Amino acid sequence: LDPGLQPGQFSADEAGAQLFAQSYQSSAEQVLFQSVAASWAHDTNITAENARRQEEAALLSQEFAEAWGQKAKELYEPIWQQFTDPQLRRIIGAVRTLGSANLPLAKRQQYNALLSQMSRIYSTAKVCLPATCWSLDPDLTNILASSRSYAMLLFAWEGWHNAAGIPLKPLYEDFTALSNEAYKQDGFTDTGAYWRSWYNSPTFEDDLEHLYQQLEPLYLNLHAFVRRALHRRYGDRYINLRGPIPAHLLGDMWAQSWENIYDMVVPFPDKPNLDVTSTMLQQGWQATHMFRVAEEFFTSLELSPMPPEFWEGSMLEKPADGREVVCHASAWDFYNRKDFRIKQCTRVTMDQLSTVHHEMGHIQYYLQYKDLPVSLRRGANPGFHEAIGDVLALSVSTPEHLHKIGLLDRVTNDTESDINYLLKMALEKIAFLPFGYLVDQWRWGVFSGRTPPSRYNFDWWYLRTKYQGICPPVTRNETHFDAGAKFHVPNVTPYIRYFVSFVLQFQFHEALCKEAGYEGPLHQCDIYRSTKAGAKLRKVLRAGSSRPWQEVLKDMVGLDALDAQPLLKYFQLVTQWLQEQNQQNGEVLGWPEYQWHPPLPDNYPEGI
Numbered sequence: 082l083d084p085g086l087q088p089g090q091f092s093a094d095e096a097g098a099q100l101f102a103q104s105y106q107s108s109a110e111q112v113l114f115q116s117v118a119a120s121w122a123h124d125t126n127i128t129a130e131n132a133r134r135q136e137e138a139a140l141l142s143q144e145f146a147e148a149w150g151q152k153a154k155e156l157y158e159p160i161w162q163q164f165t166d167p168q169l170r171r172i173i174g175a176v177r178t179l180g181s182a183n184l185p186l187a188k189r190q191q192y193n194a195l196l197s198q199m200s201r202i203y204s205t206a207k208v209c210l211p212a213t214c215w216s217l218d219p220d221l222t223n224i225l226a227s228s229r230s231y232a233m234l235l236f237a238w239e240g241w242h243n244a245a246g247i248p249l250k251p252l253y254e255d256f257t258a259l260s261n262e263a264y265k266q267d268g269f270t271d272t273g274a275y276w277r278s279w280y281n282s283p284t285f286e287d288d289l290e291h292l293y294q295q296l297e298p299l300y301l302n303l304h305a306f307v308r309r310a311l312h313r314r315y316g317d318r319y320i321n322l323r324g325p326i327p328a329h330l331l332g333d334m335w336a337q338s339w340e341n342i343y344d345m346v347v348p349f350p351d352k353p354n355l356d357v358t359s360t361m362l363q364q365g366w367q368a369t370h371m372f373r374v375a376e377e378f379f380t381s382l383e384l385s386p387m388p389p390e391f392w393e394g395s396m397l398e399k400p401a402d403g404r405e406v407v408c409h410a411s412a413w414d415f416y417n418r419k420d421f422r423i424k425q426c427t428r429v430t431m432d433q434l435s436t437v438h439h440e441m442g443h444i445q446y447y448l449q450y451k452d453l454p455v456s457l458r459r460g461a462n463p464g465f466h467e468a469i470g471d472v473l474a475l476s477v478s479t480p481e482h483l484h485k486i487g488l489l490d491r492v493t494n495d496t497e498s499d500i501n502y503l504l505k506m507a508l509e510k511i512a513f514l515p516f517g518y519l520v521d522q523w524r525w526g527v528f529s530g531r532t533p534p535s536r537y538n539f540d541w542w543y544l545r546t547k548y549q550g551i552c553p554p555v556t557r558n559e560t561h562f563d564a565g566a567k568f569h570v571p572n573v574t575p576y577i578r579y580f581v582s583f584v585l586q587f588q589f590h591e592a593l594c595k596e597a598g599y600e601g602p603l604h605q606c607d608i609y610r611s612t613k614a615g616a617k618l619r620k621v622l623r624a625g626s627s628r629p630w631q632e633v634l635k636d637m638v639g640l641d642a643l644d645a646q647p648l649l650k651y652f653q654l655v656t657q658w659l660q661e662q663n664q665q666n667g668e669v670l671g672w673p674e675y676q677w678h679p680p681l682p683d684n685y686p687e688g689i
């Protein structure tokens with residue numbers, strides 16, 4: 082480690098620790114930037130060499146965290162928890178958490194390299210036929226979204242899960258062991274316990290379970306209503322009205338949101354098509370237009386536009402030069418207060434417009450807290466970060482707003498168009514809730530040892546059936562590693578943040594709509610051009626992680642905890658309607674035939 086990055090001598094008291102923190106975060110900006118820069122070069126251009134360079138940067142980051150962590154324990158380990166400055170206590174507590182810098186050098190290299198190889202496998206895996214080959218994005222994504230051929234959907238689902246998951250499993254086992262070894266030396270029972278510590282809530286898991294209990298009836302009724310529609314399309318042979326739904330039939334490779342089968346379950350197909358994708362294509366929208374439209378929503382709230390460095394440096398379309406890239410959408414802070422970027426293989430669809438807003442919400446956060454010391458350049462918690470752009474997307478998706486931006490002819494404020502809209506939104510938001518909850522239940526069990534390699538897939542499908550009420554459409558065994566076929570697992574991105582975000586965003590929406598002076602139904606609110614709403618949001622974003630998220634949340638919504646009531650209030654009308662439809666059709670809520678799996682299509686896979 083270069084001498085200019087190594088820690089100096091400071092007095093072992095709070096005054097000295099304030100200077101210590103200043104010195105730490107001036108040198109951390111330089112180290113963070115070289116790490117982020119090298120990850121960018123790899124993720125937009127996957128090669129062996131860019132992997133080598135990203136690993137050299139990670140090693141340097143670990144030398145740096147080691148030097149400053151040790152010094153902080155040396156100087157302040159007995160005293161810092163009694164510092165009177167609460168922001169300083171946060172910074173010091175973070176610095177003395179070394180994570181993978183606790184590993185000896187050779188295990189640092191093995192850990193850094195497992196990450197590179199798992200990333201490569203996920204983002205370069207292909208599904209080949211009997212002879213070109215399909216990538217996840219756009220090819221398999223488009224098939225899962227738009228094909229209504231059971232056998233084609235099956236070939237894509239099985240092909241993807243086999244191609245990504247199987248080769249990842251031995252690597253994922255090795256990564257898990259090294260991660261745990263590292264964080265045990267910070268005092269955590271396992272890596273999962275460290276991830277959970279970010280929410281600074283002793284009742285976190287209980288609080289999440291309580292939340293899910295209030296939401297599950299909504300999901301169960303949505304599930305039964307959709308299962309009935311799939312039964313009509315595919316037949317009693319492939320759909321069991323009292324069993325789990327085959328996992329390839331819900332419009333999405335992971336069955337995690339169902340908006341792509343809206344056209345199949347829309348009760349009132351005579352009414353205007355609330356999926357404006359066709360109009361977007363008709364009108365010639367491109368990725369740049371989508372990002373500019375999102376930007377203008379932010380500036381309408383008097384938040385910040387995207388800076389020149391964003392437009393010059395971001396990757397907004399999949400490269401056509403054949404380069405391999407990580408296509409999964411992501412947002413990047415280079416910790417130099419100047420460079421901020423999105424990397425997204427943008428497609429022209431309505432759901433991609435929502436994802437553009439999701440990613441730009443991250444950038445806005447970065448811009449609002451870029452002048453905090455680096456340790457506070459974080460969401461109040463990770464769920465806050467994932468929620469920001471989704472909140473704006475809630476306003477954008479209203480038929481009123483879509484009409485304002487030229488994507489929909491005005492609809493009638495009647496009950497039936499209301500039901501169409503809330504149902505489309507339920508397919509996007511309610512259907513996700515079980516998946517957002519279960520992914521880290523699986524991963525926490527892996528980190529804790531409750532789920533050894535011998536049960537990776539057994540416990541994954543236990544949770545997928547328990548929570549989502551789906552089943553694999555072909556037999557699986559422990560050679561398969563179906564959790565590995567979901568980006569965040571090999572790319573080691575925690576997931577409970579998305580469950581938190583999907584609850585939180587309705588708490589935020591309700592607060593911002595009240596602040597805008599809106600007084601109609603919550604699900605028709607559009608906060609566009611509300612400078613009052615923008616001001617309330619700006620307060621959150623500029624706080625970073627300098628204050629406890631419970632306090633930041635109370636300032637914003639009036640309450641110091643996650644709360645399902647705003648989401649329930651948003652969906653109330655369709656919650657009731659779905660309950661009624663299910664009763665009239667005599668549905669069974671849930672999936673009591675929990676063992677059921679569909680048969681294979683005749684002659685599969687030969688007829689394609």
Ligand SMILES: *[C@@H]1O[C@H](CO[C@@H]2O[C@@H](C)[C@@H](O)[C@@H](O)[C@@H]2O)[C@@H](O[C@@H]2O[C@H](CO)[C@@H](O)[C@H](O)[C@H]2NC(C)=O)[C@H](O)[C@H]1NC(C)=O
Pocket residue numbers: 481494495496497499600601602605
């Ligand atoms: C749309 O109409 C609502 C009124 O609800 C209607 O009632 C049903 C019987 C059926 O007609 C639904 O399709 C309708 O939505 C308006 O909401 C009211 O706004 C006032 C304003 O002061 C407010 O005080 C009331 O509480 C609101 N009532 C309800 C039931 O929420 C709403 O503003 C209209 N919005 C648009 C965009 O047309």
Ligand SMILES: *[C@@H]1O[C@H](CO)[C@@H](O[C@@H]2O[C@H](CO)[C@@H](O)[C@H](O)[C@H]2NC(C)=O)[C@H](O)[C@H]1NC(C)=O
Pocket residue numbers: 126128129130131404
């Ligand atoms: C993708 O990354 C590779 C490095 O792995 C880049 O290849 C280098 O390209 C520069 C061009 O300025 C040459 O000077 C080097 O000799 C190349 N090195 C190797 C090993 O090929 C490549 O340019 C990158 N591609 C893009 C589109 O940025």
Ligand SMILES: O=C(N[C@H]1CCS[C@H]2CCC[C@@H](C(=O)O)N2C1=O)[C@@H](S)Cc1ccccc1
Pocket residue numbers: 409410411412436439440443467572574579
């Ligand atoms: O979050 C992300 N990207 C989005 C894009 C699609 S929308 C969104 C909401 C639903 C849940 C989740 C889903 O798709 O699985 N999700 C995403 O992953 C990125 S910022 C996460 C990331 C962080 C660091 C490095 C790399 C990636």
Ligand SMILES: *[C@@H]1O[C@H](CO[C@@H]2O[C@@H](C)[C@@H](O)[C@@H](O)[C@@H]2O)[C@@H](O)[C@H](O)[C@H]1NC(C)=O
Pocket residue numbers: 556557558559560
């Ligand atoms: C695991 O599964 C592998 C492939 O799946 C198999 O093929 C389908 C068509 C069905 O026959 C299904 O029952 C099978 O699982 C097998 O190659 C492998 O032997 C299976 N067992 C193990 C231990 O890997």
Ligand SMILES: [Cl-]
Pocket residue numbers: 276279463464575576577578
């Ligand atoms: Cl998280």
Ligand SMILES: [Zn+2]
Pocket residue numbers: 439440443466467
């Ligand atoms: Zn995100």
